[PDB]
Write an enzyme that holds these catalytic residues in place. Structure first.
Site, PDB file in Angstrom:
ATOM      1  N   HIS A 184       0.793  -1.216   0.000  1.00  0.00           N
ATOM      2  CA  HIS A 184       0.000   0.000   0.000  1.00  0.00           C
ATOM      3  C   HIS A 184       0.843   1.293   0.000  1.00  0.00           C
ATOM      4  CE1 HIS A 184       0.512   0.370   4.427  1.00  0.00           C
ATOM      5  NE2 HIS A 184       0.247   1.642   4.179  1.00  0.00           N
TER       6      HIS A 184
ATOM      7  N   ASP B 260      -0.486  -7.393   2.245  1.00  0.00           N
ATOM      8  CA  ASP B 260       0.104  -6.082   2.078  1.00  0.00           C
ATOM      9  C   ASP B 260       1.637  -6.191   2.079  1.00  0.00           C
ATOM     10  OD1 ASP B 260       0.297  -3.321   1.792  1.00  0.00           O
ATOM     11  OD2 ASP B 260      -0.179  -2.946   3.910  1.00  0.00           O
TER      12      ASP B 260
ATOM     13  N   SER C 133       4.495   3.242   7.945  1.00  0.00           N
ATOM     14  CA  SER C 133       4.038   2.142   7.098  1.00  0.00           C
ATOM     15  C   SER C 133       5.180   1.562   6.299  1.00  0.00           C
ATOM     16  CB  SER C 133       2.967   2.618   6.114  1.00  0.00           C
ATOM     17  OG  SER C 133       1.732   2.773   6.765  1.00  0.00           O
TER      18      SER C 133
HETATM   19  C1  LIG Z   1      -4.280   2.519   2.322  1.00  0.00           C
HETATM   20  C2  LIG Z   1      -3.598   3.051   3.569  1.00  0.00           C
HETATM   21  C3  LIG Z   1      -3.372   1.920   4.563  1.00  0.00           C
HETATM   22  C4  LIG Z   1      -3.000   2.416   5.961  1.00  0.00           C
HETATM   23  N1  LIG Z   1      -3.938   3.406   6.447  1.00  0.00           N
HETATM   24  C5  LIG Z   1      -4.548   3.387   7.688  1.00  0.00           C
HETATM   25  O1  LIG Z   1      -4.173   2.582   8.568  1.00  0.00           O
HETATM   26  C6  LIG Z   1      -5.735   4.374   7.959  1.00  0.00           C
HETATM   27  C7  LIG Z   1      -5.229   5.780   8.426  1.00  0.00           C
HETATM   28  C8  LIG Z   1      -4.361   5.811   9.689  1.00  0.00           C
HETATM   29  O2  LIG Z   1      -4.888   6.012  10.812  1.00  0.00           O
HETATM   30  N2  LIG Z   1      -3.001   5.635   9.571  1.00  0.00           N
HETATM   31  C9  LIG Z   1      -2.147   5.666  10.723  1.00  0.00           C
HETATM   32  C10 LIG Z   1      -1.182   4.482  10.925  1.00  0.00           C
HETATM   33  C11 LIG Z   1      -0.500   4.073   9.621  1.00  0.00           C
HETATM   34  C12 LIG Z   1       0.181   2.722   9.722  1.00  0.00           C
HETATM   35  C13 LIG Z   1       0.166   2.156  11.136  1.00  0.00           C
HETATM   36  N3  LIG Z   1      -1.129   2.123  11.794  1.00  0.00           N
HETATM   37  C14 LIG Z   1      -1.170   1.717  13.202  1.00  0.00           C
HETATM   38  N4  LIG Z   1      -2.034   2.521  14.018  1.00  0.00           N
HETATM   39  N5  LIG Z   1      -0.487   0.696  13.656  1.00  0.00           N
HETATM   40  C15 LIG Z   1      -1.943   3.295  11.522  1.00  0.00           C
HETATM   41  N6  LIG Z   1      -6.712   3.747   8.808  1.00  0.00           N
HETATM   42  S1  LIG Z   1      -8.248   3.355   8.409  1.00  0.00           S
HETATM   43  O3  LIG Z   1      -8.901   2.955   9.605  1.00  0.00           O
HETATM   44  O4  LIG Z   1      -8.796   4.429   7.674  1.00  0.00           O
HETATM   45  C16 LIG Z   1      -8.203   2.009   7.387  1.00  0.00           C
HETATM   46  C17 LIG Z   1      -7.963   0.719   7.939  1.00  0.00           C
HETATM   47  C18 LIG Z   1      -7.935  -0.401   7.152  1.00  0.00           C
HETATM   48  C19 LIG Z   1      -8.153  -0.297   5.754  1.00  0.00           C
HETATM   49  C20 LIG Z   1      -8.132  -1.439   4.910  1.00  0.00           C
HETATM   50  C21 LIG Z   1      -8.350  -1.295   3.558  1.00  0.00           C
HETATM   51  C22 LIG Z   1      -8.602  -0.024   2.979  1.00  0.00           C
HETATM   52  C23 LIG Z   1      -8.626   1.094   3.778  1.00  0.00           C
HETATM   53  C24 LIG Z   1      -8.402   0.984   5.183  1.00  0.00           C
HETATM   54  C25 LIG Z   1      -8.423   2.124   6.027  1.00  0.00           C
HETATM   55  C26 LIG Z   1      -4.011   4.577   5.594  1.00  0.00           C
HETATM   56  C27 LIG Z   1      -2.740   5.423   5.627  1.00  0.00           C
HETATM   57  O5  LIG Z   1      -2.331   5.853   4.396  1.00  0.00           O
HETATM   58  O6  LIG Z   1      -2.062   5.745   6.617  1.00  0.00           O
HETATM   59  C28 LIG Z   1      -4.406   4.210   4.149  1.00  0.00           C
END
Ligand SMILES: C[C@@H]1CCN(C(=O)[C@H](CC(=O)NC[C@@H]2CCCN(C(=N)N)C2)NS(=O)(=O)c2ccc3ccccc3c2)[C@@H](C(=O)O)C1
Ligand SMILES: *[C@@H]1O[C@H](CO)[C@@H](O)[C@H](O)[C@H]1NC(C)=O
Ligand code: NA
Lengths: 11, 30, 257
Positions: free
Chosen positions: C43, C99, C205
């Site tokens: 991702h 991922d 990430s």
């Molecule tokens: C596509 C990226 C994946 C990681 N991410 C996300 O994780 C988003 C935004 C975020 O809070 N990043 C903050 C951190 C980024 C990596 C580590 N993680 C931990 N707290 N350990 C969260 N969450 S989400 O709840 O909107 C989410 C969760 C699962 C999902 C699965 C499939 C599609 C969309 C999802 C969206 C976003 C980010 O860019 O940070 C977007």
């Protein structure tokens, strides 16, 4: 806020 | 043989330990 | 990294920074697994819902770094990418299943005191080390808080950050999120009643979740920072790609290419 790196890597 | 890995030149290789690695090891024996 | 602290110099010599050329920004973490291969999250490179689709020419890989922003002339190596490989069954639509991505460097890097690869686990190591309650380590240059006051608060660290987190029981992982979690993921973090905190956050990430084996003294990459809901929320846990379950894919890609 990044220091610049040689432009060869960025062109 | 197998390429060297996961042994850090500035720590394991000089018998020095980092500030918080003991926390990881202790977690194994609880 | 939320609630971590400053890494010591050379503490994570396999940590890689993914760096966008234009505009110049930190994209993601990654890890060095040999002299020509880098392991990251899928991702970081490809996520169509936000029109993210990065190419070999869009990116630089920076290795050996301590500071987030400095060009560390004597110590870091900057490499271009030959080819990106994304897991064919990477599921971006619903849960970020599989991922994982590999990147081949254009030229091999010379190892040094600051650049050294991490081990991938075998079957015995994975079975021994991947157990609820055991602690691994996450590193990165990502955000220090979920949110902060603009132009006042902290935001980004100036040096690499580190935090130690326990692996959490699969049923507690399941209960904490409405997302459908697979066997290609695990979750880590402290429980609300344990009084310690910590998490990965934006920009972390793709970075490594690593564990040390007490019997041979080596570090193993067990996970990849994948996703979470916010950063360091109570009753919430970060999720990690299960590196061992996907080792057969890695093996195919490295062997053929
Ligand atoms: C596509 C990226 C994946 C990681 N991410 C996300 O994780 C988003 C935004 C975020 O809070 N990043 C903050 C951190 C980024 C990596 C580590 N993680 C931990 N707290 N350990 C969260 N969450 S989400 O709840 O909107 C989410 C969760 C699962 C999902 C699965 C499939 C599609 C969309 C999802 C969206 C976003 C980010 O860019 O940070 C977007
Ligand atoms: C993303 O871009 C690549 C290379 O430009 C292209 O070949 C591919 O079809 C694109 N994939 C998606 C899912 O947009
Ligand atoms: Na949490």
């Amino acid at each position: 806020d990044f220091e610049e790196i040689p432009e060869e890597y960025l062109q | 043989g197998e390429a060297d890995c996961g042994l850090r030149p500035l720590f394991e290789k000089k018998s020095l330990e980092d500030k918080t690695e003991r926390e990881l090891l202790e977690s194994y024996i609880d | 990294i939320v609630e971590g602290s400053d890494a010591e110099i050379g503490m994570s010599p396999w940590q890689v920074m993914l760096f966008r050329k234009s505009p110049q920004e930190l994209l993601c973490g990654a890890s060095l697994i040999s002299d020509r291969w880098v392991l990251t999250a899928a991702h970081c490179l490809l996520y169509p819902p936000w029109d993210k689709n990065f190419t070999e020419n869009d990116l630089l890989v920076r290795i050996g770094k301590h500071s987030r922003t400095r060009y560390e002339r004597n110590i870091e190596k900057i490499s271009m990418l030959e080819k990106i490989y994304i897991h064919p069954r990477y599921n971006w639509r619903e849960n970020l299943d599989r991922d994982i991505a590999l990147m081949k460097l254009k030229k091999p890097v010379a190892f040094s005191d600051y650049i050294h690869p991490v081990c991938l686990p075998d079957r015995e190591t994975a079975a021994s080390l991947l157990q609820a309650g055991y602690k691994g380590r996450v590193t990165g240059w990502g955000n220090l808080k979920e949110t902060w006051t603009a132009n006042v608060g902290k935001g980004q660290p100036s040096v690499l950050q580190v935090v130690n987190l326990p692996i959490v029981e699969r049923p507690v992982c399941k209960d904490s999120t409405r997302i459908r979690i697979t066997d290609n993921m695990f979750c880590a973090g402290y429980k609300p009643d344990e009084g310690k905190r910590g998490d990965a956050c934006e920009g972390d990430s793709g970075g490594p979740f690593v564990m040390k084996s007490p019997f041979n003294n080596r570090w193993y990459q067990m996970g990849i920072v994948s996703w979470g809901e916010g950063c360091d929320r109570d009753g919430k846990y970060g999720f990690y790609t299960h590196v061992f379950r996907l080792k057969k894919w890695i093996q195919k890609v490295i062997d053929q290419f």
